Design a protein around this ligand. Structure first.
Ligand SMILES: *[C@@H]1O[C@H](CO)[C@@H](O)[C@H](O)[C@H]1NC(C)=O
Lengths: 50, 50
């Protein structure tokens, strides 16, 4: 079976390229605005540096 | 009177990043919350920023 005609088909495909960049502040997330809590968070500072 | 001078400053609650050298003497420090550069040094736990 040999074709005797043709069609020019345009297909659309979508690909995600990136996602929303995000940043997090340990101090104001965990220890919202209290100094007493933020002092206790210093010993865990390494974790946030991760 | 003699020829002596003195200076008075007031301590405040601050976070500091101190550097202990090989012989165990504090050779340098960074005042966290002094300026944005020292703030980044405080956040990244280093005395240099790339
Ligand atoms: C540290 O102490 C050793 C001797 O114990 C000395 O040779 C060296 O010069 C000292 N280095 C600094 C930076 O103080």
């Amino acid at each position: 079976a040999i074709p005797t005609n043709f069609t020019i088909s345009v297909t659309t495909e979508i690909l995600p390229v990136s996602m929303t960049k995000t940043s997090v502040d340990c101090t104001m997330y965990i220890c919202g605005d209290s100094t007493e809590c933020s002092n206790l968070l210093l010993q865990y500072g390494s974790f946030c540096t991760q | 009177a003699g020829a002596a001078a003195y200076y008075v400053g007031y301590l405040q609650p601050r976070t500091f990043l101190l550097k202990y050298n090989e012989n165990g003497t504090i050779t340098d420090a960074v005042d966290c919350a002094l300026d944005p550069l020292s703030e980044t040094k405080c956040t990244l736990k280093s005395f240099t920023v790339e």
